[PDB]
Amino acid sequence: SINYPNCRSWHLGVETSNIINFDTVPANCKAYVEDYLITSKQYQYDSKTVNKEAYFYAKGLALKNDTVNVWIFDLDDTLLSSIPYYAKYGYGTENTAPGAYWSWLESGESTPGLPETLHLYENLLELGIEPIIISDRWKKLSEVTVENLKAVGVTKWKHLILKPNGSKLTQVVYKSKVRNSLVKKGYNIVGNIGDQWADLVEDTPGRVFKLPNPLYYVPSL
Amino acid sequence: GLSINYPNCRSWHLGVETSNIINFDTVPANCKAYVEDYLITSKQYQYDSKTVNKEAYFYAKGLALKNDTVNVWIFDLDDTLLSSIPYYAKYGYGTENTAPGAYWSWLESGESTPGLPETLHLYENLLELGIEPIIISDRWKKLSEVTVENLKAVGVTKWKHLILKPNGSKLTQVVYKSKVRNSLVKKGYNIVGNIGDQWADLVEDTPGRVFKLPNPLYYVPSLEHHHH
Ligand SMILES: [Mg+2]
Ligand SMILES: [Mg+2]
């Protein structure tokens, strides 16, 4: 229905949540997305600036020794990249069947790490902030997820939380349930990083950081 | 005072638009060329603004609005309907410190702020849908006459209310705007949309979908709306 004559303008719209609920990347934006994500290195530069901002904030906090100080991480497209998968399917311009990405993950296919986020993850551990990784992947994918994290140098976390098999919950509601259970256990959430605004609903404490993602959209509240 | 290093200006700008970067004091000195290029040379500002106003309009078109309900859309003024660019172009495009009051003094003298045509198109289209615009501005009341003149000059005339800030008020912009919006709710108005160039304009403590216009020039402190 809406034409997006300028692909950079569309992309800013999606990053700011001015444009929501897109099922696919606009066809005319395929080359922009590929060039953004790979050739131009703008995705890398954008990612580095976000992670650096998170770190400068994190290293200014006065952490108390008597509480569990935590930082929430998303997994897909925050720590691990789905780019090799999307690259085969037209960088988000094509429809993909639900469950297909998961099947791909089950096939022995590893995902590359996102090194700017991995640097942040390592920095937070050094500051004594405890990462909690919350993922919408089904619990059946636990072993393959742990293997992939190990392959990118992530082996320590306070919790790695996956979604109950065949859960009926939307991603936004499931992640809100998890964060609220964390608060309830007395954890002090100081920050939250993810590539979807759905990951970053401000219903629990901590500063939020939105990693770029032009490939796809997860509905929010 | 404390500098912060941003070797990629575009990454910096995306950070400020998303609110990953907040409360910057001035534009990074190395990003002067970028901002001038973004706002004027490249026309990217225009294309970005067009996209935002277009989504807003297609959203508004899709609402089922009752005739008997006062259905309103909130507009910001500066860098939403009227542009501060001619002022900032004098001061390194946000890279230099400007005394507080300096901008208001510049407006008071009757300096022109050009219209932002993409927002003006949205404003006109909303009137056609029977949605009544309300303009909420942090400009002091004493700027009411120059404000009305600059609005008339760019083709804006029918608003339900034009609300300026009490002279000398000690409220922050975010708090003042929230108090105004909340009073509109109490009046029984139905806010269906809200558009502005600062997150401070767009706190979701009152109803309506929010749309954030681009602005690399400055940052207005904001507050997060606690969800349940
Ligand atoms: Mg993700
Ligand atoms: Mg403004």
Residue numbers in the entry:
A (entry chain B): 51 to 271
B (entry chain A): 49 to 276
Question: What text comes from the article?
Answer:
Arabidopsis thaliana vegetative storage proteins, VSP1 and VSP2, are acid phosphatases and belong to the haloacid dehalogenase (HAD) superfamily. In addition to their potential nutrient storage function, they were thought to be involved in plant defense and flower development. The acid phosphatase activities of these two enzymes require divalent metal such as magnesium ion. Based on protein sequence motif analysis, Arabidopsis VSP1 and VSP2 are classified as acid phosphatases of the haloacid dehalogenase (HAD) superfamily.
